[PDB]
């Protein structure tokens, strides 16, 4: 991977805002299905993703383009909607964070460097 | 009309609307037709491409972010309601990946 203007923005603007959010705590590290008591989590969710993993990938220049990082954010949110019950608080928390994600992505620099 | 909304109309909606997996999303979920009796008890804000496309055509959106939230709601509704192993979920995921890919190259500053 490499350092682009967009990936810097995703790291220093988007992720930083999401990371600090009061609903972000369940998403800052990989889902621990045993510790959280989530039955069949890894049988249902085949590509776990979380903001800690994404943050580390940004720090280690893992991504080649902004879209790749955005796809990882999407996977994290989608996993949450797929696995959990519609009425679970975690779904509402993911929706709230995801709206901020899209809002911030809307103002990301247009051409990648 | 803004530069970003034009991009969402001409690039994003254009690509998604004609996609081979788009057909279940081109009109509002008809719970009776599709045999999904609990649909509206679970999904409180239905959304679909036809509605978004109509909104784009009629200059309903004030900002690109608003249109992006409608796309997001459409996909999120699908993941929440349907079973994880349903084909519709795979179709939604495929379309959303294209949505995100294209949104990555959307104009940065919203100018009226
Ligand atoms: C991301 N999480 C973490 C979590 C923590 C507590 C209860 C449920 C969940 N499910 C998820 O999908
Ligand atoms: C958006 N759709 C449309 C659909 C078509 C056929 C079977 C299930 C669904 N569920 C959805 O969430």
Instruction: Give resolution, Å, one decimal.
Output: 1.9
Q: Is residue A54 within 8 Å of A69, Cβ to Cβ?
A: yes
In chain B, which ranges are continuous DSSP H helix?
3-7, 14-17, 31-34, 39-42, 49-57, 64-81, 87-103
The secondary structure of residue A27, as a DSSP letter, is G
Q: Is residue A19 within 8 Å of A51, Cβ to Cβ?
A: yes
* Rounded Cα distance, A33 and A47, in Å: 14
Within 10 Å of residue B54's Cβ, how many Cβ atoms? 11
Q: Which two tokens stand for residue A54?
A: 């994404």
Q: Does ligand 2 have an atom closer than 6 angstroms to the CB of B24? A: yes
Closest by CA to A72, choosing from A51, A90, A56, A91, is: A51
Tell me if B72 and A102 make a contact (CB, 8 A cut-off): yes
Tokens 């879209």 label which residue?
A67
Tell me if B81 and A86 make a contact (CB, 8 A cut-off): yes
Tell me if B108 and A110 make a contact (CB, 8 A cut-off): yes
Residue B19: half-sphere exposure toward Cβ, Cα within 13 Å: 22
Q: How far is the CA of B44 from the centre of ligand 1 (A)?
A: 22
Tokens 């085949």 label which residue?
A46
* Rounded Cα distance, B28 and B31, in Å: 9
Q: Give the domain range for residue B13.
A: 1-112
Protein residue closest via CA to atom 5 of ligand 1: A26
Task: Quote the number of domains for chain A.
Answer: 1
Q: Which two tokens stand for residue B75?
A: 């996909």
Q: Does ligand 2 have an atom closer than 6 angstroms to the CB of B81? A: yes
* Rounded Cα distance, B71 and B68, in Å: 5
Q: Which two tokens stand for residue B22?
A: 């788009």
Tokens 């999407």 label which residue?
A74
Q: How far is the CA of B89 from the centre of ligand 1 (A)?
A: 20
Residue B21: half-sphere exposure toward Cβ, Cα within 13 Å: 14
Burial class (CB in 10 A: 0-12, 13-18, 19+), B99: buried
Residue A80 neighbours by CB under 8 Å, 6+ apart: A27, A90, A91, A94
Residue A73 neighbours by CB under 8 Å, 6+ apart: A49, A51, A54, A101
* Rounded Cα distance, B24 and B29, in Å: 8
Q: Is residue B93 within 8 Å of A78, Cβ to Cβ?
A: yes
CA A108 centroid distance within chain: 16
Experimental method: X-ray
Is B70 marked as binding a ligand?
A: no
Which CATH number does the domain housing residue A67 bear?
A: 1.20.920.10
User: Between B69, B79, B89, which is nearest A102 by CB?
Assistant: B69
Q: Which two tokens stand for residue A108?
A: 């990301």
Closest by CA to B82, choosing from B39, B24, B28, is: B39
Distances (CA, A) of B65 to A78, B69, B85, B90: 19, 6, 30, 25
Q: What is the dihedral of CA A98, B54, B29, A96, to 10 degrees?
A: 10
User: Between B42, B64, B75, which is nearest A86 by CB?
Assistant: B42
């Amino acid at each position: 991977g490499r350092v682009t203007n967009q990936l810097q923005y995703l790291h220093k603007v988007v992720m930083k805002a999401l990371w600090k959010h009061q609903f972000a705590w369940p998403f800052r590290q990989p889902v621990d299905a045993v510790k959280l008591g989530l039955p069949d989590y890894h049988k249902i969710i085949k590509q776990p993703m979380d903001m800690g993993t994404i943050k580390r990938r940004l720090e280690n220049n893992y991504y080649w383009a902004a879209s790749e990082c955005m796809q990882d954010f999407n996977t994290m949110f989608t996993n949450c909607y797929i696995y959990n019950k519609p009425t679970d608080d975690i779904v509402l928390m993911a929706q709230t964070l995801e709206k901020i994600f899209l809002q911030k992505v809307a103002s990301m620099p247009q051409e990648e460097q």
